[PDB]
Amino acid sequence: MLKNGKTEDLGCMYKLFSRVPNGLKTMCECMSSYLREQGKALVSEEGEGKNPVDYIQGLLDLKSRFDRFLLESFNNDRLFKQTIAGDFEYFLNLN
């Protein structure tokens, strides 16, 4: 769903897992990994470079794209907008 950008199902999934302790934290792990997977593929310069929309300025958009999932599906939740940012800075420092 995260790759598909299916926000409604992602939002529908949110409410189900919001019920249990750390269930949303269990999500933080998946977006954390999903964020890390997206980040590493972009920050790793290869060949003759990569398109600006992907890496040069898309890297900053990667957080925004994940922020859209945070907004459109995850109710601008504290736990996500506070946790996933660490991954973004983690592989952003590799620039």
Q: How far is CA 63 from CA 16, 47, 80, in A?
A: 25, 24, 12
Which residue, 67, 64, 2, is CA-closest to 33?
2
Lookup: tokens for 18: 């919001």
Tokens 């790793």 label which residue? 44
Please tell me the experimental approach by which this structure was elucidated.
cryo-EM
Question: Please, are residues 70 and 85 in contact by the beta-carbon 8 Å criterion?
Answer: no
Residues ≥6 apart with Cβ < 8 Å to 43: 55, 59, 91, 92, 94, 95
- Which H or E element spans position 40? helix 23-43
Question: Please, are residues 2 and 31 in contact by the beta-carbon 8 Å criterion?
Answer: yes
Which residue, 25, 7, 28, 10, is CA-closest to 85?
28
CA distance 31 to 45: 23
At 40, give phi and psi (nearest 5°).
-65, -40
Measured in angstroms, the resolution is: 3.6
Question: What's CA 86's distance to the chain center, in Å?
Answer: 11
